[model samples]
Target chain A: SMSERPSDLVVNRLVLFVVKGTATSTANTVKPLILLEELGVPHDIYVVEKVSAPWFSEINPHKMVPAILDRSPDGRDTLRAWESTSTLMYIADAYDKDGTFGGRNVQERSEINNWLTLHTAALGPTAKYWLYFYKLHPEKLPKTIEKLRSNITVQYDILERRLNEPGQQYLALKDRPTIADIATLPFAMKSTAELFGLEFEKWPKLQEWSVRMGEREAVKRAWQRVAGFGHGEKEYGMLE
Target chain B: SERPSDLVVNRLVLFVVKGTATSTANTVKPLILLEELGVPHDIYVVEKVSAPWFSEINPHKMVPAILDRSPDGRDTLRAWESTSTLMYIADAYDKDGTFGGRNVQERSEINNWLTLHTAALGPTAKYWLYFYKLHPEKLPKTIEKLRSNITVQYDILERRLNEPGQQYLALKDRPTIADIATLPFAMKSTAELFGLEFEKWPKLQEWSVRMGEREAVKRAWQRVAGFGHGEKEYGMLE
Candidate 1:
């Protein structure tokens, strides 16, 4: 029944459920959205306020947002994938036939997966803790805050150095964006940087890279769709 | 050349460094998998991860990186990060999908748990170790949050292993990269290092024992223990 809801961009039977909120609330949720838009994959977006709802728990045992249910073209099989990075890789593998964003070969795929795993293992989680202490934690623990700040800075420095490598533009690929870029962009976006009280000026290459990623058409559309989800807004409506 | 070990020619090179008393969990992960797949690889023990030479291999300057020259006439590939290194080995050597997956669906399932470990379990445990062992100041509240997060991650794994058809974290019949990725952290040594006990999570305890008892795992741990130079102080704290 949830799948039967009328969709605005109904191209396939894919249904992506993301947490409904501003960019901050849906940080991980926006990652897969960027990929879907880049690949131009036709799917429906379902926004939920409570990911812990019993129905949603079956999709992601961890009770996190950005879960997807991809139905086979023949309608025989429906694969449920969760975990933001996992979902991005799954979408790339299942939909990106030309291997544009996913990867074209074993070496490329290995590099892409390495960076994606690094983002998941290092950047995203470190930034999450940094944000928690910087903005949410009532007791301002300077030691903990300073440590997290340093950790995040190191991760940024890593990315900055990677970008500065000869002929490299994106994280995984030189010429264009890959799932690595898509998965990491949300965390490094301006909103998150502002929340963490970080200055992009410190990592100039990363600042330029972030600007380039934000300028993409798919990036623009994904942000618009996520920002307007569940608000009943029509300008960036899913039905449009 | 820093390659003057008693290693055979034409094999992958895995770079590892010593931990405080033993090998860090991340460094041990790929070593276990390499032994499991019977992959002939050389171990290059680094005296210090921050040494200038190691930076060329990993900008992050972490241990557990690999330099593979067996690309079959293609350029050599270098991969770092313990989980990603495990993946690289599986992709290049596990040709039958023994620990990797045979199909897309299986691979997806494997990746779900793999990413869960990378994103949640591993990092949370790292923080717990830092706060509990290394940090000069003890922030009780931050430590409590990290402890709770680690407990929840264990509970998730225990529940998955307790599922009727499941034996490992990601697969029903055997362990995959997911289990390999998490085994080191769940080991008794790690629990002891964190000053915690596994009495509450019997399933996770049994799973760790099951994984640690393998012949390949034993050999890998031995090699890790014997590798490295200088005083075998805690590597993480340094």
Candidate 2:
């Protein structure tokens, strides 16, 4: 079901490259998926078992999942964006008509950019590393996992402080939500505690924001598409 | 000379943390663009990355943030992260779209590559740097892993530059911020620092040489003159 050639897909439809069924792919896929649903952009999800296949390298040189093949803004040629942050930028700039989710002005854009860069460079990497070293990596290196876990907490502290600022609800400190929130939401939500083996007590504000982000309609739909909203592998009977 | 807070005319200040030339957070990226765009700007060498002043400017506490004067050109506004700073400067300054792009289509192409730097090269280069500098364990396996990652990213760039007329990774023949963004990391010295052989990525090395020869890039390098790597006089660049 996921191997159809791009030539077969028509215009205005984006192809999302995702792993078929896993929390890892689900988390990464939800960022772009939420953008498509929220922006009302039409897209198709391609659930792939192998990212290193020959056909995949043309689309994403990294051969990593969560890449996109989308029609360019002018509809001239298909453009490829790898990684979730870039994918979020592509969909937002292409589809956000009212400029509700992205920055409408230069200053606003800068603020959004600051936060989005933080998420992409620091927070996202920390979360992924923590999961890999702690829960997923077969080697189970204790020192590496602990180091990653500590770094994750430090990153969360920064987010917690931002939210606790005088009048900040979102990462960008903007009144309305932007792609910054969406870019970070999938990785920062409730599963973070489970993935890293921690309680949310220290990050009260962050936990609250995670709950709020999870409540969004687009987030719910993206969640369902992955494995039904709020359902984990065990809940889906995939775990023994 | 580090303080520009007294300047009456609002312009731009690219804040770079005090580190050797090889520090990935160095001001090379934004400095290249400001010179190319002819944007009136100053360079502030932040002495400490974790300084409270640095935290005040960027809560993330990283370097290469820019403090831009508003369009009215008075009140100061701050933008952090080097890539974000480059994008902001391009939007506010590059009306001719010489360094950024002409339209959304071209800009998106540039942005995609910029994001690639942020997500892939930047992070991979960082871990590699960490292993070389501060990795306490000095685990040979971990260092080798990071080296492999750096190689993997470089290999991807090699693949992209093989496209027809694509001298740069993000544009057809012209150099864009995409090239500028990755140049500092892909320089020959950094590759040598990692013990990587550019024979596998000849096109990337060619593009790197072209970018290094740019007048503006050379000026940026001079701006950080005397900042050399320990035991290596010219740092990783020479």
Candidate 3:
């Protein structure tokens, strides 16, 4: 009774996304890379370059890149995206209907989505500012560090407890990756080696999983491109 | 898809997070703030007159408070969140960007979209409020509307798109923290919570598609999604 049946299901093909120059980037970039890697879907990257005027205007008049052009199962290219979680949902609904990481069931998916929303709304933003004020801007380092530490530690405890106790195999449910993990990793990466001069040692396994996450081929390639590790495509990653 | 003609535009930030002493920490509004600024900063507690272990590993271990670690460092940290933090970050990190940047022009002329999020995103917390497992008042009519209301924020964006020539919220050039902060909720409201379609607002729909594909946002999800499967309950009882 639960299965929708194969004939009724519409399988989509190909996704064209304008993700930020690289995967490791803090610009809400990881969700697509996770899907691209996990789904084993073939795709194209548009304008990995981060230079000059008019380039951004082309992809999104809003100047936001990292958009997606997904081919609906019927062969029509549907714009299956904007916000990170929504795009993740579009892919899940349109593609991973088997409940891969969208949750094994509906309520689980709802919880995952709900928390994902909070991820974007609070945890990610709080950590981002906390690290930025403390690490990048030296003058206010003390207050920024104090505030970042104070604010994030509460959330840190929550995530740390979950990462450790829920069996330490995964975050939401079990030993598998879910859309929620995909949603939150990019900002966490910001506090690690990339932007902020901090580490995830407190959450030992999360730190390990986080480092291993960078090693995934798709993630590695995406980050390589984003971190300006590749020779020719080394256009952005302007940390220097 | 028609939004109320005179949409309320709110300016202050107010979030009633479940105390962080438990597992569920209030982390949403902050993410929106950083994206709005296009930079990063550390999260902090409100620094209450009382000492508390509201948080995990560092600091005083308190949360549910807002503090601003601005680059300029003019003592902007304060207790109570959303509103104070937003203004504090604006003064600190949003230097050349927008909000209250160095220039007077950017901060003085605030846009409609910015205010709408502060006004709408949280007040509409009714979606989750009603959806909560237990209702304090048990208002049935209001709860039923929330089922519809949960997805209502997107319509407001659609209405914005309906405007003559606008492309994005805040300014067409870029999104303010107001826009970024509100989007996380709006996306959660319409796409995930309702499982409804987005064919209604073309530009808003497209805009959402773009933001949804972000890496930072995606990574968090992958971690959460590792949880395994879906578990949706229909009645407020769930």
> What TM-score would every model get versus the actual structure?
0.90, 0.88, 0.46
DockQ of each: 0.57, 0.54, 0.03
- Tens digit per residue, CA lDDT, model 3, B1-238: 3322221112211212222222112244444555544553332222232333322211223233433322334323232334334544554456565554232222211222443353345434523453344444444443444455545666656766665565456455554554555555555344544455656557777676666576644543332222112242110011
Of 1 and 3, the candidate ahead on TM-score is: 1
Q: Rank the candidates by DockQ, best first.
A: 1, 2, 3
lDDT of 3 by residue, A102-152 (tens): 665433443354345445545655665555456554355353355445655
Which digits, one per residue and each the tens of the lDDT, describe model 1 over residues B1-238?
5433342335688888754464557888898989999997777766677776577777778888887864574577778889889889988899899899876777878888998898888988888878876898888888987887888888888777777878788888888998999988886777776667886788889889988888988987776776644444322111
State the DockQ, from 0 to 1, for candidate 3: 0.03
Name the candidate, 2 or 3, with the larger TM-score value.
2
Give the 10-residue window scoring lowest on summed lDDT in candidate 3 chain B.
Answer: B229-238
RMSD value for candidate 1: 4.2
Encode model 1's per-residue lDDT on A1-240: one tens digit a residue. 232333343325677887656756678888888999998887887765566666666667898878887775456777677899889978886889898998787688778877888899898889888877777877888889889988888888889889999989999989889999998888776666776778878888888899999999999998887777777654332332
Best by DockQ: 1
Q: Find the 10 residues in a row with the least total lDDT in model 1 chain B.
A: B229-238
Which run of 10 residues does model 2 chain A get worst, by summed lDDT? A231-240
Considering only N, C-alpha and C atoms within 3 Å, which residue pairs clash in candidate 1?
B19-B235, B20-B233, B20-B234, B20-B235
C-alpha RMSD for every candidate: 4.2, 5.4, 20.3
lDDT of 1: 0.79
